[PDB]
Amino acid sequence: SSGLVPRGSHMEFVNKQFNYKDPVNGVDIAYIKIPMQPVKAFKIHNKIWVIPERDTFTNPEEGDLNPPVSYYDSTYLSTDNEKDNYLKGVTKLFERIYSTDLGRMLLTSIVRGIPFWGGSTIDTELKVIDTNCINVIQPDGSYRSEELNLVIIGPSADIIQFECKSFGHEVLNLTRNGYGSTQYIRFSPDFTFGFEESLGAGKFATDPAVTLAHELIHAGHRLYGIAINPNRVFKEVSFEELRTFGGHDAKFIDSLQENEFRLYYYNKFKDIASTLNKAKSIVGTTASLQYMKNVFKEKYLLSEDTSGKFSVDKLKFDKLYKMLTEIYTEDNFVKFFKVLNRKTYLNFDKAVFKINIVPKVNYTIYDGFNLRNTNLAANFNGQNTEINNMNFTKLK
Ligand SMILES: [Zn+2]
């Protein structure tokens, strides 16, 4: 048993207890194409899909799992049992994230963060951007385009290179102009990293719910188009990484720089407001202009006057911006999960471990590895790779 529903009747965020072999149905289990042969995918929530495959799709130069802190294994995730376990493990982590107040906030923000309809060359016309959709095949074999915000997919060649990436635009920088774009997270629930810590020094494992939450925090930044340019770095660790980690690491971003960033994205949100105001037409949908305007009023928390004209309210912008950049941090998830974690963004080890968080005897939504009323409950024993060695196989 997987313990996917420790309380209540049904999972609170993931919409179905999927099995990889469940039949396709064109709605929440479907063969899909990314904008290649279709892959079987699972819609775990409004705007969120899971592709339990190694990622040989998003990047054309990374279309092979051949090897050239990394770990390679071209056979991982090639069989149906593994894809089923992947799906259930990702499902379990979403529920673990959603069982905390902070995670319900972050995932709500993610779901509301629809990529902006900024794809038209006519600045009075709202139009989707094609690369913020997937093509979903129905049972009868037709396609329909579906907008989405987030795809979780298996890693490419380097199994432990987890990241949040997205398709770019010829001219627009969608992750930094407030528009946002569909985010693809390369991630595996089946491996984790070791760090050392003294409570002799101990050899502990990172809780994969923390790692997933980290990538989801990036996704939130990028869905609201407020990511920091990857060329801002401390010599390399990017400001974007420091901000996502949070804690004292974030305090190192000089605070005058932060105000400059905040004013920049405030102005970008104002540009979005006046695009919505100058909009006269909409293409590629049966939904009215006014309705899609309101989707984006809702996303960016725009104010609307009696005339129907949108604007950015300074207090609402600061609230949203602060949530996405200061409240949603790895360090804050560590505090909510009450797990052990590296204390600064660089202090990870070269150690990699195979794990299996699906069986509830190994890992639970409420306690992670540190199972209550067991010897793993105290001193983070469940994450200690020597004490709880039955849950960690060392690979490198
Ligand atoms: Zn990161």
Structure tokens at 228: 């920091």
Q: Do the bridges between strand 233-234 and strand 237-238 make them parallel or antiparallel, or are there none, so unpaired?
A: antiparallel
Coil, helix or strand for 92? helix
Is 298 considered catalytic here? no
52 CA → ligand 1 middle, Å: 21
Structure tokens at 122: 């006519």
Backbone φ and ψ of 258, nearest 5°:
-60, -50
Q: Is 351 left (phi over 0), alpha (psi -120 to 50) or beta?
A: beta
How was it solved?
X-ray
Residue 257 exposure: Cα atoms within 13 Å on the Cβ side: 12
Backbone φ and ψ of 300, nearest 5°:
-90, 5
301 CA → ligand 1 middle, Å: 26
Distance from C-alpha of 1 to C-alpha of 360, rounded to nearest angstrom = 6
164 CA → ligand 1 middle, Å: 8
Distance from C-alpha of 92 to C-alpha of 305, rounded to nearest angstrom = 43
Residue spans of alpha helices (H) in 239-326: 239-245, 247-250, 255-277, 289-300, 314-322
Binding-site residue set: 214, 218, 241
What is the per-residue DSSP string for 279-294?
A: --EE-S-SS-HHHHHH
Q: What is the CA radius of gyration of the chain?
A: 21
Coil, helix or strand for 77? coil
Structure tokens at 345: 């963004």
Residue spans of alpha helices (H) in the chain: 80-98, 101-112, 208-223, 239-245, 247-250, 255-277, 289-300, 314-322, 330-337
Distances (CA, A) of 327 to 342, 347, 389: 18, 22, 34
244 CA → ligand 1 middle, Å: 7
Q: Which residues pair with 184 in a beta bridge?
A: 151, 165
| Displacement of CA 87 from its chain's centroid (Å) | 15
| Burial class of residue 248, CB neighbours in 10 A (0-12, 13-18, 19+) | exposed
CB 395 within 8 A of CB 193: no
Residue identified by tokens 């509301």 is 112
Coil, helix or strand for 157? coil
Backbone φ and ψ of 392, nearest 5°:
-135, 120
121 CA → ligand 1 middle, Å: 33
Structure tokens at 130: 């094609």
Cβ-Cβ contacts under 8 Å for 184 (sequence gap 6 or more)? 55, 58, 151, 153, 164, 165, 166
| Burial class of residue 113, CB neighbours in 10 A (0-12, 13-18, 19+) | buried
Binding-site residue set for Zn(2+): 214, 218, 241
| Burial class of residue 311, CB neighbours in 10 A (0-12, 13-18, 19+) | middle
282 CA → ligand 1 middle, Å: 36
CB atoms within 10 A of CB 69: 12
Distance from C-alpha of 37 to C-alpha of 97, rounded to nearest angstrom = 32
CB 388 within 8 A of CB 117: no
Structure tokens at 29: 């289990």
343 CA → ligand 1 middle, Å: 15
Closest CA to 177 of 133, 136, 129: 129
* Catalytic residue (choose from 215, 236, 304, 386): 215
What's the maximum distance between 2 C-alpha atoms anywhere in the chain?
68
Distance from C-alpha of 304 to C-alpha of 286, rounded to nearest angstrom = 23
Distance from C-alpha of 262 to C-alpha of 314, rounded to nearest angstrom = 11
Residue 191 exposure: Cα atoms within 13 Å on the Cβ side: 24
Structure tokens at 343: 């204390």
Q: Is 225 left (phi over 0), alpha (psi -120 to 50) or beta?
A: left
Closest CA to 50 of 22, 74, 73, 8: 22
Resolution given for this structure, in angstroms: 2.0
Q: Do the bridges between strand 48-54 and strand 39-45 make them parallel or antiparallel, or are there none, so unpaired?
A: antiparallel
Distance from C-alpha of 385 to C-alpha of 203, rounded to nearest angstrom = 6
Closest CA to 94 of 130, 48, 148: 48
Which residues have beta carbons under 5 A from ligand 1 (an ion)? Answer: 241
